[PDB]
Amino acid sequence: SMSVKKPKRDDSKDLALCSMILTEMETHEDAWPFLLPVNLKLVPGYKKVIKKPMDFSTIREKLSSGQYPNLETFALDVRLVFDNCETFNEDDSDIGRAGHNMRKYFEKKWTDTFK
């Protein structure tokens, strides 16, 4: 509350570390469904169904341009990528599986880096 603060968690490396995580996600072999925005002209249904499209290139631009106020907003966009993927793809598809794998991979890096 006013003039009463919890001790200051050092957040000065968060930017760099989210960048590193993002790089590792970008370079994973199962990243391919997620590298670019889904083409909303060419994928029937996507536009109407997926209210908040997200992909790694868009996360990378937001990161590079100071559009994440903190590391939680960054993690929310990453997760959104996988949540969207699950909404639109069968678990038993290559993309569906990619998404489960990438999420698992992300969450581990996240925990190891920050928790």
Curated annotation (Swiss-Prot):
The lineage of its organism: Eukaryota, Metazoa, Chordata, Craniata, Vertebrata. Component of the BRF-1 ISWI chromatin remodeling complex, at least composed of SMARCA1 and BAZ2B, which regulates the spacing of histone octamers on the DNA template to facilitate access to DNA. Within the BRF-1 ISWI chromatin remodeling complex interacts with SMARCA1; the interaction is direct. Component of the BRF-5 ISWI chromatin remodeling complex, at least composed of SMARCA5/SNF2H and BAZ2B, which regulates the spacing of histone octamers on the DNA template to facilitate access to DNA. Expressed at varying levels in several tissues, whereas a smaller transcript was expressed specifically in testis. It comes from the Eukaryota. Regulatory subunit of the ATP-dependent BRF-1 and BRF-5 ISWI chromatin remodeling complexes, which form ordered nucleosome arrays on chromatin and facilitate access to DNA during DNA-templated processes such as DNA replication, transcription, and repair. Both complexes regulate the spacing of nucleosomes along the chromatin and have the ability to slide mononucleosomes to the center of a DNA template. The BRF-1 ISWI chromatin remodeling complex has a lower ATP hydrolysis rate than the BRF-5 ISWI chromatin remodeling complex. This is Bromodomain adjacent to zinc finger domain protein 2B. The chain holds residues 2054 to 2166 of 2168 of the full protein. Belongs to the WAL family. Residues 9-113 form the Bromo domain. It is found in: Nucleus.
